[PDB]
């Protein structure tokens, strides 16, 4: 498995932000992250490239469609320094 | 990191730390700071001591223990609600048989 996959699994239960290949940003609490980067998310606030913002309850996006994630700074401590 | 935890595991157990004398009587060709390249190595404060009583006595001193704690944590300062000798002592018999 990937070390960043391992971190991303640690990120479960936290509030993360996600940018997809389309460019829409989903901020919310990450329920579940599979090995394939498929992520289940809660109470998501979404900002579109046009600037419009919406709210949704439960969202699940495919791994392949995710440009990148931003995860909280708490995890930066360890154990990935090694 | 993990190597620092191994260094910890070293400066904790003395039985292995006791012997830096393995050379016994031997000739070695070449202000206590950053090591003398010889003598007894204290990496915590970065001092090397030419005699044993200074090396161990300094270790028994508070300052060396203060630095040893400031490296990571304070186990050196760390009741007996009978679980200490029951569980810990039973672990002494168990580990003793494991080594034997």
């Amino acid at each position: 498995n990937g070390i960043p996959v391992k971190l991303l699994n640690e990120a479960q239960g936290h509030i993360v932000s996600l940018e997809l290949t389309t460019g829409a940003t989903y901020r919310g609490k990450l329920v579940e992250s599979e090995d394939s980067m498929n992520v289940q998310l809660r109470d998501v606030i979404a900002t579109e490239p046009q600037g419009a913002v919406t709210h949704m309850d439960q969202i699940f996006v495919r791994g392949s469609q995710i440009k990148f994630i931003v995860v909280p700074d708490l995890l930066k401590n360890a154990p990935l320094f090694k | 990191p993990i190597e620092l935890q191994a260094l910890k595991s070293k400066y904790t157990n003395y039985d292995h730390l006791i012997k830096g004398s393995l050379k016994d009587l031997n000739k070695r060709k070449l202000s206590f700071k950053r090591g003398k390249k010889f003598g007894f190595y204290c990496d915590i404060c970065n001092l090397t001591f030419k005699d044993t009583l200074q090396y161990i006595d300094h270790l028994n001193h508070k300052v060396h223990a203060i630095k040893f704690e400031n490296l990571f944590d304070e186990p050196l300062i760390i009741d007996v609600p009978q679980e200490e000798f029951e569980l810990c002592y039973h672990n002494l018999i168990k580990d003793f048989v494991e080594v034997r």
């Binding site: - | 003395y14 039985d15 730390l17 006791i18 044993t52 009583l53 161990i56 006595d57 270790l59 028994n60 060396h64 223990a65 186990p75 050196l76 300062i77 760390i78 007996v80 009978q82 200490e84 000798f85 029951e86 810990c88 002592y89 039973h90 002494l92 018999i93 168990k94 003793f96 048989v97 034997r100």
Partner: protein, 167 residues
């Protein structure tokens, strides 16, 4: 203040059990400064103090015994813990090997007459004196039987340089 001289055990002090000369021989000895006291035991710790002695043909001969006994004194653990450490772990035979006379001479120094429990400890040490055990001791070299060292010890005034009182 001479040495630590703290606490309890017969209303005066704990370290008074051992003479000044031998006590300062130990506190000035290498073994005490290395493997014992606060930096080695993370403060006073009886179970880790036992980790030292248990960690020590066997190399340890009954200096190191004087020192480990002295730290047993200065720490002064519970008589209950003495009971457990004495009577537990019957599933292994290498555990109490040199701990026998250690926990023995310890209580031999402690008190002279909790009282009934101490007497039960003594009569149990008599049973172990009947247990027919053999051990070696050094200062010269003398191997002695547990029956001779326990009875000769309780009946004898001085033991390896430390005097004893009559219980």
């Amino acid at each position: 203040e001479s040495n630590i001289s703290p606490k309890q055990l017969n209303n005066q002090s704990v370290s008074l059990v051992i003479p000044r000369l031998t006590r300062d021989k130990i506190h000035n000895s290498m073994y005490y400064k290395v493997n014992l006291s606060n930096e080695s035991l993370r403060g006073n710790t009886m179970v880790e103090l036992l980790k030292v002695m248990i960690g020590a043909h066997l190399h340890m001969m009954v200096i190191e015994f004087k020192c480990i006994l002295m730290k047993l004194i200065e720490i002064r653990p519970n008589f209950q813990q003495l009971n457990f450490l004495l009577n537990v772990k019957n599933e292994n035979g290498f555990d109490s090997k040199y701990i026998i006379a250690l926990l023995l001479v310890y209580a031999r120094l402690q008190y002279y007459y909790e009282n009934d429990l101490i007497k039960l400890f003594k009569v149990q040490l008599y049973k172990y004196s009947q247990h027919y055990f053999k051990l070696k001791s050094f200062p010269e070299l003398c191997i002695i039987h547990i029956d001779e060292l326990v009875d000769w010890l309780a009946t004898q005034d001085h033991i390896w340089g430390i005097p004893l009182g009559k219980c």
